[PDB]
Amino acid sequence: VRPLNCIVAVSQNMGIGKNGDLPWPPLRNEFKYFQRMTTTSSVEGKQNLVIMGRKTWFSIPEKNRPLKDRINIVLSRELKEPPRGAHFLAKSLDDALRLIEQPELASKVDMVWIVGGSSVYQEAMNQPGHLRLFVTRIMQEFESDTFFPEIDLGKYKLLPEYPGVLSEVQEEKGIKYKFEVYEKKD
Ligand SMILES: NC(=O)C1=CN([C@@H]2O[C@H](COP(=O)(O)OP(=O)(O)OC[C@H]3O[C@@H](n4cnc5c(N)ncnc54)[C@@H](OP(=O)(O)O)[C@@H]3O)[C@@H](O)[C@H]2O)C=CC1
Protein backbone atom coordinates (compact mmCIF):
# COMPACT_ATOMS: atom_id res chain seq x y z
CA VAL A 1 0.00 0.00 0.00
CA ARG A 2 3.18 2.21 -0.18
CA PRO A 3 6.20 0.85 -2.07
CA LEU A 4 5.27 1.17 -5.80
CA ASN A 5 5.81 -1.98 -7.86
CA CYS A 6 5.99 -1.48 -11.61
CA ILE A 7 5.62 -4.63 -13.68
CA VAL A 8 6.36 -4.71 -17.40
CA ALA A 9 7.46 -7.08 -20.16
CA VAL A 10 9.95 -5.40 -22.54
CA SER A 11 11.56 -6.42 -25.79
CA GLN A 12 15.34 -5.97 -26.32
CA ASN A 13 14.55 -2.60 -28.01
CA MET A 14 12.54 -1.51 -24.91
CA GLY A 15 9.23 -1.99 -26.75
CA ILE A 16 6.08 -2.61 -24.70
CA GLY A 17 3.32 -1.88 -27.24
CA LYS A 18 2.24 -1.93 -30.91
CA ASN A 19 -1.06 -0.62 -32.34
CA GLY A 20 -2.76 -0.85 -28.91
CA ASP A 21 -1.67 -4.46 -28.47
CA LEU A 22 1.53 -6.31 -27.45
CA PRO A 23 4.48 -6.34 -29.93
CA TRP A 24 4.92 -10.16 -29.62
CA PRO A 25 2.40 -13.00 -30.05
CA PRO A 26 0.59 -13.97 -26.80
CA LEU A 27 3.00 -15.40 -24.21
CA ARG A 28 0.49 -17.21 -21.95
CA ASN A 29 3.32 -18.38 -19.61
CA GLU A 30 4.61 -14.83 -19.11
CA PHE A 31 1.02 -13.64 -18.48
CA LYS A 32 0.76 -16.33 -15.74
CA TYR A 33 3.78 -14.66 -14.01
CA PHE A 34 2.10 -11.27 -14.41
CA GLN A 35 -1.16 -12.66 -12.89
CA ARG A 36 0.56 -14.40 -10.02
CA MET A 37 2.82 -11.42 -9.07
CA THR A 38 0.04 -8.76 -9.28
CA THR A 39 -2.70 -10.94 -7.65
CA THR A 40 -0.83 -12.55 -4.74
CA SER A 41 -1.23 -10.41 -1.58
CA SER A 42 1.05 -11.08 1.37
CA VAL A 43 -1.99 -11.00 3.67
CA GLU A 44 -5.24 -12.95 3.65
CA GLY A 45 -8.21 -10.54 3.64
CA LYS A 46 -6.38 -7.86 1.62
CA GLN A 47 -6.23 -7.49 -2.18
CA ASN A 48 -3.41 -6.12 -4.26
CA LEU A 49 -4.21 -3.08 -6.23
CA VAL A 50 -3.37 -2.28 -9.91
CA ILE A 51 -3.05 1.25 -11.34
CA MET A 52 -3.17 1.63 -15.15
CA GLY A 53 -3.63 4.19 -17.92
CA ARG A 54 -6.91 4.41 -19.80
CA LYS A 55 -5.36 2.94 -23.03
CA THR A 56 -3.95 -0.09 -21.16
CA TRP A 57 -7.44 -0.63 -19.55
CA PHE A 58 -9.35 -0.69 -22.89
CA SER A 59 -6.48 -2.81 -24.37
CA ILE A 60 -7.29 -5.59 -21.87
CA PRO A 61 -9.76 -7.98 -23.54
CA GLU A 62 -13.22 -7.21 -22.08
CA LYS A 63 -13.63 -10.85 -21.09
CA ASN A 64 -10.59 -10.19 -18.78
CA ARG A 65 -11.66 -6.82 -17.21
CA PRO A 66 -11.44 -5.94 -14.40
CA LEU A 67 -8.18 -7.76 -13.54
CA LYS A 68 -9.93 -10.23 -11.27
CA ASP A 69 -9.19 -10.38 -7.50
CA ARG A 70 -7.30 -7.07 -7.66
CA ILE A 71 -8.61 -3.58 -6.97
CA ASN A 72 -8.45 -1.80 -10.37
CA ILE A 73 -7.74 1.94 -10.66
CA VAL A 74 -7.77 3.61 -14.09
CA LEU A 75 -6.11 7.00 -14.75
CA SER A 76 -7.85 9.38 -17.14
CA ARG A 77 -8.00 13.12 -17.54
CA GLU A 78 -11.19 12.89 -19.71
CA LEU A 79 -13.43 10.10 -18.39
CA LYS A 80 -15.86 11.45 -15.78
CA GLU A 81 -16.90 8.10 -14.36
CA PRO A 82 -14.85 4.88 -13.89
CA PRO A 83 -15.02 2.54 -16.89
CA ARG A 84 -17.56 -0.26 -16.36
CA GLY A 85 -15.80 -2.89 -14.18
CA ALA A 86 -13.12 -0.53 -12.80
CA HIS A 87 -13.15 0.16 -9.03
CA PHE A 88 -11.86 3.74 -9.08
CA LEU A 89 -11.10 6.49 -11.56
CA ALA A 90 -8.41 9.09 -10.79
CA LYS A 91 -7.42 12.18 -12.81
CA SER A 92 -3.68 11.98 -11.88
CA LEU A 93 -1.22 9.48 -10.47
CA ASP A 94 -0.91 11.78 -7.46
CA ASP A 95 -4.70 11.50 -6.85
CA ALA A 96 -4.44 7.72 -7.16
CA LEU A 97 -1.52 7.47 -4.69
CA ARG A 98 -3.32 9.76 -2.16
CA LEU A 99 -6.50 7.62 -2.43
CA ILE A 100 -4.57 4.42 -1.77
CA GLU A 101 -3.21 5.76 1.50
CA GLN A 102 -6.66 6.72 2.85
CA PRO A 103 -7.59 4.90 6.10
CA GLU A 104 -10.76 3.38 4.51
CA LEU A 105 -8.48 1.40 2.12
CA ALA A 106 -5.84 0.25 4.72
CA SER A 107 -7.75 -2.86 5.77
CA LYS A 108 -8.35 -3.50 2.11
CA VAL A 109 -5.11 -3.06 0.12
CA ASP A 110 -1.79 -4.85 0.28
CA MET A 111 0.65 -4.35 -2.60
CA VAL A 112 0.41 -1.61 -5.22
CA TRP A 113 1.23 -2.57 -8.79
CA ILE A 114 1.74 -0.10 -11.70
CA VAL A 115 0.77 -2.09 -14.81
CA GLY A 116 1.31 0.41 -17.57
CA GLY A 117 0.91 3.15 -19.64
CA SER A 118 4.37 4.23 -20.88
CA SER A 119 3.63 7.58 -19.27
CA VAL A 120 2.24 5.83 -16.19
CA TYR A 121 5.53 3.94 -15.73
CA GLN A 122 7.43 7.22 -16.40
CA GLU A 123 5.52 9.06 -13.63
CA ALA A 124 5.78 6.18 -11.15
CA MET A 125 9.58 6.04 -11.69
CA ASN A 126 9.80 9.87 -11.03
CA GLN A 127 8.49 9.25 -7.49
CA PRO A 128 10.79 9.72 -4.48
CA GLY A 129 10.87 6.80 -2.05
CA HIS A 130 10.56 3.04 -2.44
CA LEU A 131 10.22 1.66 -6.00
CA ARG A 132 10.51 -1.85 -7.44
CA LEU A 133 10.66 -2.70 -11.14
CA PHE A 134 9.51 -6.22 -12.03
CA VAL A 135 10.92 -6.47 -15.56
CA THR A 136 10.42 -9.42 -17.96
CA ARG A 137 13.29 -9.27 -20.43
CA ILE A 138 11.91 -10.63 -23.73
CA MET A 139 15.26 -11.57 -25.36
CA GLN A 140 14.25 -10.57 -28.88
CA GLU A 141 13.51 -7.38 -30.89
CA PHE A 142 9.92 -6.62 -31.89
CA GLU A 143 8.40 -3.77 -33.89
CA SER A 144 7.07 -1.31 -31.27
CA ASP A 145 4.82 1.82 -30.84
CA THR A 146 5.32 2.52 -27.17
CA PHE A 147 8.35 2.00 -24.93
CA PHE A 148 9.55 1.56 -21.35
CA PRO A 149 11.63 4.40 -19.78
CA GLU A 150 15.39 3.94 -19.36
CA ILE A 151 16.41 2.13 -16.18
CA ASP A 152 19.14 4.20 -14.48
CA LEU A 153 21.52 1.67 -12.89
CA GLY A 154 22.83 4.40 -10.52
CA LYS A 155 19.31 4.59 -9.08
CA TYR A 156 17.96 0.98 -9.39
CA LYS A 157 19.82 -2.03 -7.93
CA LEU A 158 19.37 -5.34 -9.82
CA LEU A 159 18.44 -7.73 -7.03
CA PRO A 160 20.35 -11.03 -7.27
CA GLU A 161 17.22 -12.88 -6.22
CA TYR A 162 13.72 -11.99 -5.02
CA PRO A 163 11.22 -14.17 -3.07
CA GLY A 164 8.95 -16.20 -5.41
CA VAL A 165 10.79 -15.14 -8.57
CA LEU A 166 12.68 -17.79 -10.60
CA SER A 167 15.81 -16.52 -12.34
CA GLU A 168 16.38 -19.20 -15.01
CA VAL A 169 15.85 -18.34 -18.68
CA GLN A 170 12.37 -19.35 -19.85
CA GLU A 171 11.09 -19.98 -23.30
CA GLU A 172 7.67 -20.06 -24.98
CA LYS A 173 6.88 -20.50 -28.70
CA GLY A 174 10.58 -20.14 -29.49
CA ILE A 175 10.75 -16.78 -27.63
CA LYS A 176 13.27 -16.63 -24.75
CA TYR A 177 12.69 -14.44 -21.66
CA LYS A 178 13.68 -14.00 -18.00
CA PHE A 179 12.38 -12.27 -14.87
CA GLU A 180 14.31 -9.47 -13.22
CA VAL A 181 13.66 -7.34 -10.15
CA TYR A 182 15.14 -3.84 -9.59
CA GLU A 183 14.88 -1.75 -6.45
CA LYS A 184 15.26 1.91 -5.53
CA LYS A 185 14.82 2.63 -1.81
CA ASP A 186 14.23 5.87 0.20
N1 LIG B 1 4.36 -5.04 -22.31
C1 LIG B 1 3.80 -4.54 -21.21
O1 LIG B 1 4.19 -4.82 -20.09
C2 LIG B 1 2.61 -3.60 -21.35
C3 LIG B 1 2.23 -3.15 -22.62
N2 LIG B 1 1.13 -2.27 -22.75
C4 LIG B 1 0.80 -1.82 -24.12
O2 LIG B 1 1.06 -0.40 -24.06
C5 LIG B 1 0.05 0.28 -24.91
C6 LIG B 1 -0.85 1.17 -24.03
O3 LIG B 1 0.04 2.02 -23.26
P1 LIG B 1 0.15 3.59 -23.59
O4 LIG B 1 -0.21 3.82 -25.00
O5 LIG B 1 1.44 4.07 -23.07
O6 LIG B 1 -1.07 4.27 -22.79
P2 LIG B 1 -1.55 4.24 -21.24
O7 LIG B 1 -2.11 2.93 -20.84
O8 LIG B 1 -0.46 4.86 -20.41
O9 LIG B 1 -2.76 5.21 -21.45
C7 LIG B 1 -2.54 6.54 -21.85
C8 LIG B 1 -3.72 7.26 -21.31
O10 LIG B 1 -3.93 6.96 -19.86
C9 LIG B 1 -4.33 8.15 -19.19
N3 LIG B 1 -3.17 8.66 -18.33
C10 LIG B 1 -1.88 8.27 -18.38
N4 LIG B 1 -1.16 8.87 -17.43
C11 LIG B 1 -2.00 9.64 -16.73
C12 LIG B 1 -1.85 10.52 -15.65
N5 LIG B 1 -0.67 10.72 -15.06
N6 LIG B 1 -2.93 11.18 -15.18
C13 LIG B 1 -4.11 10.99 -15.75
N7 LIG B 1 -4.28 10.18 -16.78
C14 LIG B 1 -3.26 9.50 -17.29
C15 LIG B 1 -4.93 8.60 -20.52
O11 LIG B 1 -5.91 9.51 -20.35
P3 LIG B 1 -7.06 10.03 -21.29
O12 LIG B 1 -8.37 9.27 -21.07
O13 LIG B 1 -7.06 11.32 -20.43
O14 LIG B 1 -6.60 10.26 -22.70
C16 LIG B 1 -3.71 8.80 -21.38
O15 LIG B 1 -4.09 9.20 -22.67
C17 LIG B 1 -0.76 -0.82 -25.60
O16 LIG B 1 -0.05 -1.13 -26.81
C18 LIG B 1 -0.66 -1.97 -24.59
O17 LIG B 1 -0.86 -3.25 -25.23
C19 LIG B 1 0.42 -1.80 -21.59
C20 LIG B 1 0.79 -2.28 -20.33
C21 LIG B 1 1.89 -3.16 -20.21
PDB file of all heavy atoms in Angstrom, residues 106-117:
ATOM      1  N   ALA A 106      -6.966   0.908   4.038  1.00  0.00           N
ATOM      2  CA  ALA A 106      -5.842   0.252   4.715  1.00  0.00           C
ATOM      3  C   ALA A 106      -6.103  -1.220   4.991  1.00  0.00           C
ATOM      4  O   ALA A 106      -5.233  -2.087   4.759  1.00  0.00           O
ATOM      5  CB  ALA A 106      -5.519   0.981   6.026  1.00  0.00           C
ATOM      6  N   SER A 107      -7.307  -1.497   5.494  1.00  0.00           N
ATOM      7  CA  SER A 107      -7.751  -2.856   5.768  1.00  0.00           C
ATOM      8  C   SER A 107      -7.930  -3.616   4.473  1.00  0.00           C
ATOM      9  O   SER A 107      -8.091  -4.842   4.488  1.00  0.00           O
ATOM     10  CB  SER A 107      -9.102  -2.826   6.499  1.00  0.00           C
ATOM     11  OG  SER A 107      -9.505  -4.140   6.856  1.00  0.00           O
ATOM     12  N   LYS A 108      -7.912  -2.897   3.350  1.00  0.00           N
ATOM     13  CA  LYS A 108      -8.348  -3.497   2.105  1.00  0.00           C
ATOM     14  C   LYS A 108      -7.202  -3.806   1.125  1.00  0.00           C
ATOM     15  O   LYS A 108      -7.339  -4.692   0.283  1.00  0.00           O
ATOM     16  CB  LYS A 108      -9.393  -2.608   1.423  1.00  0.00           C
ATOM     17  CG  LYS A 108     -10.523  -2.107   2.318  1.00  0.00           C
ATOM     18  CD  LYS A 108     -11.887  -2.749   1.956  1.00  0.00           C
ATOM     19  CE  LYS A 108     -12.428  -2.187   0.637  1.00  0.00           C
ATOM     20  NZ  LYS A 108     -13.682  -2.844   0.146  1.00  0.00           N
ATOM     21  N   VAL A 109      -6.103  -3.065   1.220  1.00  0.00           N
ATOM     22  CA  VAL A 109      -5.113  -3.059   0.119  1.00  0.00           C
ATOM     23  C   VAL A 109      -3.755  -3.515   0.645  1.00  0.00           C
ATOM     24  O   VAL A 109      -3.284  -3.036   1.691  1.00  0.00           O
ATOM     25  CB  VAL A 109      -5.010  -1.670  -0.581  1.00  0.00           C
ATOM     26  CG1 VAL A 109      -3.824  -1.597  -1.556  1.00  0.00           C
ATOM     27  CG2 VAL A 109      -6.338  -1.282  -1.277  1.00  0.00           C
ATOM     28  N   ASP A 110      -3.131  -4.433  -0.072  1.00  0.00           N
ATOM     29  CA  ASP A 110      -1.790  -4.854   0.283  1.00  0.00           C
ATOM     30  C   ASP A 110      -0.776  -4.185  -0.649  1.00  0.00           C
ATOM     31  O   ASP A 110      -0.388  -3.061  -0.422  1.00  0.00           O
ATOM     32  CB  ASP A 110      -1.630  -6.380   0.266  1.00  0.00           C
ATOM     33  CG  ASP A 110      -0.279  -6.826   0.846  1.00  0.00           C
ATOM     34  OD1 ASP A 110       0.251  -6.071   1.672  1.00  0.00           O
ATOM     35  OD2 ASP A 110       0.256  -7.902   0.510  1.00  0.00           O
ATOM     36  N   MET A 111      -0.340  -4.881  -1.696  1.00  0.00           N
ATOM     37  CA  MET A 111       0.653  -4.346  -2.604  1.00  0.00           C
ATOM     38  C   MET A 111       0.034  -3.488  -3.691  1.00  0.00           C
ATOM     39  O   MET A 111      -1.089  -3.763  -4.153  1.00  0.00           O
ATOM     40  CB  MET A 111       1.423  -5.488  -3.277  1.00  0.00           C
ATOM     41  CG  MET A 111       2.103  -6.406  -2.303  1.00  0.00           C
ATOM     42  SD  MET A 111       2.931  -7.695  -3.304  1.00  0.00           S
ATOM     43  CE  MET A 111       4.385  -6.849  -3.774  1.00  0.00           C
ATOM     44  N   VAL A 112       0.772  -2.456  -4.086  1.00  0.00           N
ATOM     45  CA  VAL A 112       0.408  -1.607  -5.224  1.00  0.00           C
ATOM     46  C   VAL A 112       1.290  -1.867  -6.459  1.00  0.00           C
ATOM     47  O   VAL A 112       2.520  -1.796  -6.403  1.00  0.00           O
ATOM     48  CB  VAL A 112       0.421  -0.079  -4.877  1.00  0.00           C
ATOM     49  CG1 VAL A 112       0.021   0.747  -6.116  1.00  0.00           C
ATOM     50  CG2 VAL A 112      -0.571   0.199  -3.753  1.00  0.00           C
ATOM     51  N   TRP A 113       0.613  -2.165  -7.567  1.00  0.00           N
ATOM     52  CA  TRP A 113       1.234  -2.566  -8.794  1.00  0.00           C
ATOM     53  C   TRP A 113       0.908  -1.518  -9.835  1.00  0.00           C
ATOM     54  O   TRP A 113      -0.250  -1.211  -9.997  1.00  0.00           O
ATOM     55  CB  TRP A 113       0.730  -3.956  -9.229  1.00  0.00           C
ATOM     56  CG  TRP A 113       1.287  -5.043  -8.352  1.00  0.00           C
ATOM     57  CD1 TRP A 113       0.726  -5.562  -7.217  1.00  0.00           C
ATOM     58  CD2 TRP A 113       2.569  -5.671  -8.499  1.00  0.00           C
ATOM     59  NE1 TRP A 113       1.579  -6.496  -6.658  1.00  0.00           N
ATOM     60  CE2 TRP A 113       2.706  -6.589  -7.434  1.00  0.00           C
ATOM     61  CE3 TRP A 113       3.611  -5.559  -9.451  1.00  0.00           C
ATOM     62  CZ2 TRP A 113       3.844  -7.388  -7.282  1.00  0.00           C
ATOM     63  CZ3 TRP A 113       4.733  -6.351  -9.293  1.00  0.00           C
ATOM     64  CH2 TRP A 113       4.845  -7.240  -8.213  1.00  0.00           C
ATOM     65  N   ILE A 114       1.932  -0.968 -10.493  1.00  0.00           N
ATOM     66  CA  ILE A 114       1.737  -0.102 -11.701  1.00  0.00           C
ATOM     67  C   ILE A 114       1.826  -1.024 -12.923  1.00  0.00           C
ATOM     68  O   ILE A 114       2.834  -1.673 -13.126  1.00  0.00           O
ATOM     69  CB  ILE A 114       2.838   1.005 -11.797  1.00  0.00           C
ATOM     70  CG1 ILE A 114       2.914   1.868 -10.528  1.00  0.00           C
ATOM     71  CG2 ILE A 114       2.720   1.845 -13.104  1.00  0.00           C
ATOM     72  CD1 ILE A 114       1.655   2.572 -10.114  1.00  0.00           C
ATOM     73  N   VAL A 115       0.769  -1.104 -13.730  1.00  0.00           N
ATOM     74  CA  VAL A 115       0.768  -2.093 -14.806  1.00  0.00           C
ATOM     75  C   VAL A 115       0.784  -1.484 -16.224  1.00  0.00           C
ATOM     76  O   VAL A 115       0.612  -2.190 -17.216  1.00  0.00           O
ATOM     77  CB  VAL A 115      -0.337  -3.168 -14.644  1.00  0.00           C
ATOM     78  CG1 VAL A 115      -0.217  -3.828 -13.257  1.00  0.00           C
ATOM     79  CG2 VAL A 115      -1.718  -2.597 -14.876  1.00  0.00           C
ATOM     80  N   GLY A 116       0.993  -0.172 -16.291  1.00  0.00           N
ATOM     81  CA  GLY A 116       1.310   0.409 -17.575  1.00  0.00           C
ATOM     82  C   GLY A 116       0.360   1.502 -17.958  1.00  0.00           C
ATOM     83  O   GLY A 116      -0.577   1.822 -17.226  1.00  0.00           O
ATOM     84  N   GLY A 117       0.551   1.863 -19.218  1.00  0.00           N
ATOM     85  CA  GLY A 117       0.911   3.150 -19.643  1.00  0.00           C
ATOM     86  C   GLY A 117       2.432   3.355 -19.666  1.00  0.00           C
ATOM     87  O   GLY A 117       3.046   3.347 -18.629  1.00  0.00           O
TER      88      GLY A 117
END
